């Protein structure tokens with residue numbers, strides 16, 4: 001935190017607006033959830049999205065698998081997350 005002052009860049013989309021927020025590894029599900037609530041001023045569900053599919057991320061295991069997609073892809077530079085109330 002203060003020490004922090006390989007990150008995972010998450011591109012959040014909420015109501016058509018996008019922004020990128022970086023998270024240090026290992027990325028904790030509870031930390032992403034907290035950052036979303038803090039930044040957007042309300043809790044929002046995390047949906048990993050590609051051009052065709054989205055999947056709700058329910059827990060650390062789901063988040064780890066989504067980050068692994070990111071890490072296995074040479075072209076993907078951020079993790080696309082659709083936020084829904």
Ligand SMILES: [Ca+2]
Pocket residue numbers: 070071072073074075076077
């Ligand atoms: Ca990558």
